[PDB]
Amino acid sequence: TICIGYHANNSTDTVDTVLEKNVTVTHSVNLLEDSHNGKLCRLKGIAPLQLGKCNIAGWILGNPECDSLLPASSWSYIVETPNSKNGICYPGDFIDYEELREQLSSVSSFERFEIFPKESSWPKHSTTKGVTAACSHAGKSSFYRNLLWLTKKEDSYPKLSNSYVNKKGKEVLVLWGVHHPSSSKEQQTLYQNENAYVSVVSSNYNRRFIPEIAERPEVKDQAGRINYYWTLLEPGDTIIFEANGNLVAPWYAFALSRGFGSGIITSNASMHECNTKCQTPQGAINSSLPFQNIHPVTIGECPKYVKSAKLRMVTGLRNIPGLFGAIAGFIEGGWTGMIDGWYGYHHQNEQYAADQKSTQNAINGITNKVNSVIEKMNTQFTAVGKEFNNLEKRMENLNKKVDDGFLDIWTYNAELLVLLENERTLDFHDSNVKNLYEKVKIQLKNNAKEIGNGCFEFYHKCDNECMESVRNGTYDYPKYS
Amino acid sequence: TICIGYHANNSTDTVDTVLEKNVTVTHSVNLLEDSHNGKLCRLKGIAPLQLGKCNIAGWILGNPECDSLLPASSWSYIVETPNSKNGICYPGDFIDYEELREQLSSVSSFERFEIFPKESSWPKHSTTKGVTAACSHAGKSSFYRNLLWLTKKEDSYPKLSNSYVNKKGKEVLVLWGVHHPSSSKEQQTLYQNENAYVSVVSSNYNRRFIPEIAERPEVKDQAGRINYYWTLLEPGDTIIFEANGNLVAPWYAFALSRGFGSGIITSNASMHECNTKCQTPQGAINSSLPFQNIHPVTIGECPKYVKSAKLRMVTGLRNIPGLFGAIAGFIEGGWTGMIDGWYGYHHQNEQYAADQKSTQNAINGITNKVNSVIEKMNTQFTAVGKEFNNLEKRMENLNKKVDDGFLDIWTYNAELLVLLENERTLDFHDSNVKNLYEKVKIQLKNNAKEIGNGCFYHKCDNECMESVRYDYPKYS
Amino acid sequence: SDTICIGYHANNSTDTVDTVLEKNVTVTHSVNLLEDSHNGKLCRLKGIAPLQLGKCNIAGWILGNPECDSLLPASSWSYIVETPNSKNGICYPGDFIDYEELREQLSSVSSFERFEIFPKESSWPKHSTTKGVTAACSHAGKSSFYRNLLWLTKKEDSYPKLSNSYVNKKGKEVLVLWGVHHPSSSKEQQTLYQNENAYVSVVSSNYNRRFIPEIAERPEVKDQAGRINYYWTLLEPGDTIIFEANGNLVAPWYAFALSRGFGSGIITSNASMHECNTKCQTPQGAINSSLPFQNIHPVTIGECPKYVKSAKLRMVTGLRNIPGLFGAIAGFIEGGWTGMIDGWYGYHHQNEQYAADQKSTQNAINGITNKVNSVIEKMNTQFTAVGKEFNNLEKRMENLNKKVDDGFLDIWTYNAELLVLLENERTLDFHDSNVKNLYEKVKIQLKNNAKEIGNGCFEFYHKCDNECMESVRNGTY
Ligand SMILES: *[C@@H]1O[C@H](CO)[C@@H](O[C@@H]2O[C@H](CO)[C@@H](O[C@@H]3O[C@H](CO)[C@@H](O)[C@H](O[C@H]4O[C@H](CO)[C@@H](O)[C@H](O)[C@@H]4O)[C@@H]3O)[C@H](O)[C@H]2NC(C)=O)[C@H](O)[C@H]1NC(C)=O
Ligand SMILES: *[C@@H]1O[C@H](CO)[C@@H](O)[C@H](O)[C@H]1NC(C)=O
Ligand SMILES: *[C@@H]1O[C@H](CO)[C@@H](O)[C@H](O)[C@H]1NC(C)=O
Ligand SMILES: *[C@@H]1O[C@H](CO)[C@@H](O)[C@H](O)[C@H]1NC(C)=O
Ligand SMILES: *[C@@H]1O[C@H](CO)[C@@H](O)[C@H](O)[C@H]1NC(C)=O
Ligand SMILES: *[C@@H]1O[C@H](CO)[C@@H](O)[C@H](O)[C@H]1NC(C)=O
Ligand SMILES: *[C@@H]1O[C@H](CO)[C@@H](O)[C@H](O)[C@H]1NC(C)=O
Ligand SMILES: *[C@@H]1O[C@H](CO)[C@@H](O)[C@H](O)[C@H]1NC(C)=O
Ligand SMILES: *[C@@H]1O[C@H](CO)[C@@H](O)[C@H](O)[C@H]1NC(C)=O
Ligand SMILES: *[C@@H]1O[C@H](CO)[C@@H](O)[C@H](O)[C@H]1NC(C)=O
Ligand SMILES: *[C@@H]1O[C@H](CO)[C@@H](O)[C@H](O)[C@H]1NC(C)=O
Ligand SMILES: [K+]
Ligand code: NA
């Protein structure tokens, strides 16, 4: 008596299918990465720039609270934290701030340099009194490290004129401010001239600022305001500053080097000496799976983020220790006793064997099925959040509509692919067992009684020799009938 | 003679499959909601705010045509109509109007309050002559209810300085205007001083305005212009207004409560005393279907909008009153006489029965298949159109490219899924019938003749026919 | 020794497709879904030629930059072509305010009429109209200027308050351009416009802007320390625009009455114009295809297949070519019959004296015809989709626009490549099914009268001639 049957094991792997959920299967692959090291890591060997208690504004202006960032020159990405609260210390408006954050997100390294050396650039103006209790440091009134708040020298503020020629071979980021006093008494005290102007021109930047005197609510005990400005000076170009008051002059500028794959993320994780190909605000990922459910914000080469809790793909068959009627059908159960293949035979004679041809073709096909569908899935490169000022609610909502829309498409695509192809993987195995069985019934013909549960009760007695004949596809029906 | 066959009924339900269109099937479910009550309803018990003939500007400024909106304090969504034509009655520019619309789209309730009480805040200026024929009410010249057009008092306009401290614990929306007269005679008549300014400053707002005198084409017979401005004053912050002319001063402001799920829609439907979980400009939807084709604009929890006319999913089989060769194959037709199941047996002996095991496993799987794909579809929360001014065409087109891209993908996903899985569901039934038949062929073996159309050498009564549903040797 | 056999088609095809279980599967018949061929040329759309800006860009064309004189008599087009040499824009340095928006507005203009809105010869009697030239806009070795603007200057040391209005009686929206000049010095301001403090005012019923010229020492661009800010507005039909100035006005000279169409746009291409008509135009060349997908270029004009990032989308229709789930094809029926030319599934007889089965074969064609059609319909054609432009303070919006384009393209490429992978398996299964059903159809007829070898052949236990073979194939046995 020869029987035909399929594999069973001690596996608890569950997948879901179109017709049935919580289907226990013999073998499966996880497609969804849910593990991370909970740390900030280097990316391709380059550590990120950690702004800590500072935000982008405080770093680029040189807020005294951020002095430890002053020597930073190259990074792989930028990390803000939940306590990145130090930006502008003196009240005002940072014009096109979010655009500057976008500019700095593709900066891989920069050279901070003294664009107008303090001790020699301003002989006719005071360079020593531009400090405020709003930018305190070490118990004293102080000021930004990258700006120089010029004031009158000996009751005079002559027309100032200073130029810089960009000989760096790179774009130079130039920052300045215009100070808006709270009274004309303050205007006279700081700059002498009551009717001031500031002009900033380059070959592609051209703005004139007229300071406004006004009574304002005090912010950090300050009724004045500084508006902060920035521009990118192209290589070879000149930028010209002219003023008779109220100029918060550039002191340090940045020659920028552009790179690929950087971005600004907000994380509470701590920096460790790890190296990763993929970084999230939650931690680093080490995986080749096509999907992750850890965070939508990613730095590097990452799996696509999806809103799923499980994405298990069946590769083996139903674990029983059907569209084609064999598995869980007329062959009621599986054989844990057969460990060496997915499909096989069981011989019971006087004197368990798995079929290698059918099992190796199934193994080949399922491997191509897993590989071919993961291939259609593409690596997620750097994708981060974006910031918008309080008059850009429509754009902010448009950006959120775009990100949520794609995330819903990819989550639907992923969950539905697995659900529908899991059911086709079980039908594939059921088909393989039904084809192996029928190939044995066309080989024995009249020489055996079909019991109907995958077994052929032999009428004659042939020992092991002809039993391998049945399996090998070399069984001689005439000799025994 | 015992036969194996499948169910048929008087159903005309049609589906489309990958290999054949217009396939009549025994049972199906519609996945596409196309019905609505044609009314505006409450959402979670809260009525919408109906602006009627007014648009957002006329309402929030207090255009005299909108007096009936003045007491409105809480709403679930905002309805403009095709006749929402009353906005600014005196001509000019409403600066960052579309942004204000976006801001108000997330307001669930507000408190309208007098930020500068008219009779006590302006002792040195006139509060009684700032009316215009462009904002007529009751046959007389009038003005906005939330603005106060100050003018000179006794031939002088002293420098004015007024401040408001937000003690409301909420953002306060403050609106004001700057008037730009058409001539210097008009400037002197209204404000005396020829060179005027308006300054409005807070802790995070800081703007100064110089009125501009120019000859302009008349709009509503007005050659002057008013620029309307707004800002959100944070809790605890102070806003200071300073001017020596041309100030349309704030009179009423709004303490705002933010909420989730609101929006502004344009509808011609009328309000009724219904409550709904889902509202569109055409009418409210009461459905659990994953899709609708009624409107892309939705308020609440709604089915996903798709551009399809039909999304019917086959649950039963082909209606005959195959991949596996049985249904519409060697079993050429179905049995209307069998009413109690999808697959069953028919006996003709000397002395119709549905199989419960095979039919209930088909029902269990088909139920899971419909439920499993409807879960993959997630409810649509509030999604409404947006507005852009005439220098934001690129942004407007980008918004339209985004909205169109998503709808083309979803319409494709839904239409293709139903098309492919319909063929797949009918194959499932063909497999169940071919598996039912083969289970019988191996039980009867040589004791019966297989006619080959799904259909006894001995004479076997009713008792033994249920045996199969069979001790072959015992009754051989 | 009389045998009917059941088989399937074979031919000499090298057509190859990919399947979810196997790659490089050679099939008998397949259809390409992916247009990769174009003519390499720019062509008319609906018989209307594009506007080739050539060495000029939108700014230089619309202002009338003298390098662009040859575009002046162009009145209608089907789309606008910039080239990689489209570098002539503003010739006098300055800022073209809201330029990208203006490009976006012209993308929808099908034709326009250029006309003297303020005729030079008669609109400015109290001002000079002949001295507003510069070496920055050189023409023919001489100082010249934009063809559509007029640089008004002082007349005999008098530049009086100027005021001119235009009432749009054209029935279409009118595009009006002007400039405001910002001189380098206080002397330049007096030398050109006399009055020290000047202003420009431009008001319509929906437009109200004022300009105050700013004098500042500036780096020279094209030998000019001054700057001009260029401006534009659309005057609605019946609306009136009014210019008032006391200097610094670069006045509108020619304006444009626009006709809006559908489906135009601006593309960058380096292909040459050729005398051809096309429903579909891309920067690389024109497409003539009914296929649903193309991989030529994402920019298109007209009605085009949808762009995907794919190198091959071939969809099997015929059979596995051998000269499955169901066990017949490449199963117990091991190989195919090149000798059965007129059908997908048929019979072979060995009598004493190949045949296609019409019924099962013509049903499989109808099914396969319907599958490929049903899939092509779900795909919709690409209407005009073009790139957008953004100035240097719109980097976030530029990226957001790219995240959108990149997002959709990835999704449609995934959709097309997964649809063909998965449905190619289903089609091969379908063919293994049709063969098996036919082979079991024959088996149930013969029952006891024939021995089943198991390779699709039935050796009939009686004698069976050409008449009895037709019985088996006809089903009349
Ligand atoms: C748009 O279409 C035109 C049409 O052909 C196309 O033109 C090509 O331009 C390139 C570059 O401008 C040409 O290139 C050269 O070929 C000559 C021989 O004719 C060489 O001598 C040149 O070499 C010199 O210069 C280099 C730069 O310094 C040096 O590195 C080099 O050692 C040489 O000194 C140069 O290779 C080319 O001839 C034409 N034509 C063709 C058919 O290529 C243009 O490129 C297209 N534009 C775009 C943006 O695609
Ligand atoms: C489960 O199977 C693995 C591999 O056969 C074996 O190493 C392990 O001991 C088994 N455990 C149990 C509890 O059966
Ligand atoms: C799923 O099946 C497992 C067997 O692997 C069982 O232990 C578990 O309770 C089941 N859970 C559900 C939710 O069906
Ligand atoms: C971030 O980590 C620090 C370290 O303990 C802790 O003070 C803070 O609560 C954390 N914040 C969040 C949001 O996890
Ligand atoms: C990532 O995981 C693999 C899994 O075996 C491991 O071999 C490899 O060392 C891991 N990489 C890092 C950087 O830890
Ligand atoms: C069709 O059959 C259903 C069975 O539920 C019955 O209710 C209905 O009345 C029938 N149609 C007609 C026209 O009688
Ligand atoms: C669908 O079939 C019915 C009858 O089978 C027919 O009356 C109807 O016209 C068909 N539908 C279409 C759109 O042709
Ligand atoms: C709404 O639908 C529910 C079921 O979801 C139904 O019970 C109820 O009658 C319907 N009511 C209205 C007003 O449509
Ligand atoms: C197959 O034979 C036909 C018959 O002439 C021929 O036209 C065709 O080119 C051949 N196949 C290939 C790939 O050339
Ligand atoms: C694919 O199969 C063809 C036969 O049709 C063969 O010539 C070729 O080398 C194979 N491999 C490819 C195309 O990479
Ligand atoms: C497009 O291709 C068809 C197919 O040969 C051809 O007949 C037609 O002339 C072509 N049309 C153009 C405009 O090239
Ligand atoms: K800002
Ligand atoms: Na506006």
PDB file of N, CA and C and ligand atoms in Angstrom, chain C residues 83-85 269-272, ligand 1:
ATOM      1  N   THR C  83      14.001  75.642 -25.452  1.00  0.00           N
ATOM      2  CA  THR C  83      15.111  74.767 -25.836  1.00  0.00           C
ATOM      3  C   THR C  83      16.165  74.869 -24.747  1.00  0.00           C
ATOM      4  N   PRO C  84      17.233  74.066 -24.794  1.00  0.00           N
ATOM      5  CA  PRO C  84      18.381  74.322 -23.901  1.00  0.00           C
ATOM      6  C   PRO C  84      19.126  75.630 -24.186  1.00  0.00           C
ATOM      7  N   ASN C  85      18.890  76.298 -25.312  1.00  0.00           N
ATOM      8  CA  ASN C  85      19.481  77.614 -25.521  1.00  0.00           C
ATOM      9  C   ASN C  85      18.499  78.760 -25.265  1.00  0.00           C
ATOM     10  N   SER C 269      12.636  71.112 -24.984  1.00  0.00           N
ATOM     11  CA  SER C 269      12.999  70.050 -25.911  1.00  0.00           C
ATOM     12  C   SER C 269      14.127  70.522 -26.812  1.00  0.00           C
ATOM     13  N   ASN C 270      14.898  69.557 -27.307  1.00  0.00           N
ATOM     14  CA  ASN C 270      15.983  69.829 -28.235  1.00  0.00           C
ATOM     15  C   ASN C 270      15.746  69.137 -29.564  1.00  0.00           C
ATOM     16  N   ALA C 271      14.531  68.687 -29.814  1.00  0.00           N
ATOM     17  CA  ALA C 271      14.199  68.096 -31.101  1.00  0.00           C
ATOM     18  C   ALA C 271      13.794  69.177 -32.093  1.00  0.00           C
ATOM     19  N   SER C 272      13.994  68.883 -33.364  1.00  0.00           N
ATOM     20  CA  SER C 272      13.686  69.845 -34.403  1.00  0.00           C
ATOM     21  C   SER C 272      12.241  69.723 -34.888  1.00  0.00           C
TER      22      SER C 272
HETATM   23  C1  LIG D   1      20.872  69.863 -28.771  1.00  0.00           C
HETATM   24  O1  LIG D   1      21.088  69.325 -30.078  1.00  0.00           O
HETATM   25  C2  LIG D   1      22.365  69.658 -30.641  1.00  0.00           C
HETATM   26  C3  LIG D   1      22.365  69.130 -32.059  1.00  0.00           C
HETATM   27  O2  LIG D   1      23.416  68.199 -32.281  1.00  0.00           O
HETATM   28  C4  LIG D   1      23.477  69.077 -29.769  1.00  0.00           C
HETATM   29  O3  LIG D   1      24.747  69.461 -30.287  1.00  0.00           O
HETATM   30  C5  LIG D   1      25.983  68.949 -29.969  1.00  0.00           C
HETATM   31  O4  LIG D   1      26.631  69.812 -29.028  1.00  0.00           O
HETATM   32  C6  LIG D   1      27.866  69.274 -28.541  1.00  0.00           C
HETATM   33  C7  LIG D   1      28.314  70.157 -27.400  1.00  0.00           C
HETATM   34  O5  LIG D   1      27.891  71.500 -27.590  1.00  0.00           O
HETATM   35  C8  LIG D   1      28.855  69.223 -29.697  1.00  0.00           C
HETATM   36  O6  LIG D   1      30.104  68.720 -29.232  1.00  0.00           O
HETATM   37  C9  LIG D   1      31.424  68.642 -29.610  1.00  0.00           C
HETATM   38  O7  LIG D   1      31.878  67.962 -30.769  1.00  0.00           O
HETATM   39  C10 LIG D   1      32.994  68.615 -31.387  1.00  0.00           C
HETATM   40  C11 LIG D   1      33.214  68.018 -32.781  1.00  0.00           C
HETATM   41  O8  LIG D   1      32.271  68.608 -33.689  1.00  0.00           O
HETATM   42  C12 LIG D   1      34.190  68.461 -30.422  1.00  0.00           C
HETATM   43  O9  LIG D   1      35.368  69.030 -31.005  1.00  0.00           O
HETATM   44  C13 LIG D   1      33.840  69.142 -29.052  1.00  0.00           C
HETATM   45  O10 LIG D   1      34.866  68.905 -28.095  1.00  0.00           O
HETATM   46  C14 LIG D   1      35.173  70.070 -27.437  1.00  0.00           C
HETATM   47  O11 LIG D   1      34.754  70.824 -26.335  1.00  0.00           O
HETATM   48  C15 LIG D   1      34.703  70.146 -25.086  1.00  0.00           C
HETATM   49  C16 LIG D   1      34.195  71.146 -24.036  1.00  0.00           C
HETATM   50  O12 LIG D   1      35.284  71.939 -23.548  1.00  0.00           O
HETATM   51  C17 LIG D   1      36.095  69.565 -24.780  1.00  0.00           C
HETATM   52  O13 LIG D   1      36.010  68.855 -23.584  1.00  0.00           O
HETATM   53  C18 LIG D   1      36.552  68.634 -25.949  1.00  0.00           C
HETATM   54  O14 LIG D   1      37.840  68.018 -25.701  1.00  0.00           O
HETATM   55  C19 LIG D   1      36.558  69.432 -27.230  1.00  0.00           C
HETATM   56  O15 LIG D   1      37.559  70.437 -27.024  1.00  0.00           O
HETATM   57  C20 LIG D   1      32.486  68.676 -28.505  1.00  0.00           C
HETATM   58  O16 LIG D   1      32.700  67.381 -28.003  1.00  0.00           O
HETATM   59  C21 LIG D   1      28.300  68.337 -30.807  1.00  0.00           C
HETATM   60  O17 LIG D   1      29.142  68.403 -31.954  1.00  0.00           O
HETATM   61  C22 LIG D   1      26.877  68.756 -31.206  1.00  0.00           C
HETATM   62  N1  LIG D   1      26.289  67.781 -32.115  1.00  0.00           N
HETATM   63  C23 LIG D   1      26.106  66.481 -31.823  1.00  0.00           C
HETATM   64  C24 LIG D   1      25.474  65.650 -32.903  1.00  0.00           C
HETATM   65  O18 LIG D   1      26.437  65.995 -30.741  1.00  0.00           O
HETATM   66  C25 LIG D   1      23.336  69.569 -28.332  1.00  0.00           C
HETATM   67  O19 LIG D   1      24.242  68.872 -27.483  1.00  0.00           O
HETATM   68  C26 LIG D   1      21.927  69.319 -27.804  1.00  0.00           C
HETATM   69  N2  LIG D   1      21.767  69.900 -26.479  1.00  0.00           N
HETATM   70  C27 LIG D   1      21.466  69.174 -25.396  1.00  0.00           C
HETATM   71  C28 LIG D   1      21.332  69.933 -24.109  1.00  0.00           C
HETATM   72  O20 LIG D   1      21.311  67.958 -25.452  1.00  0.00           O
END
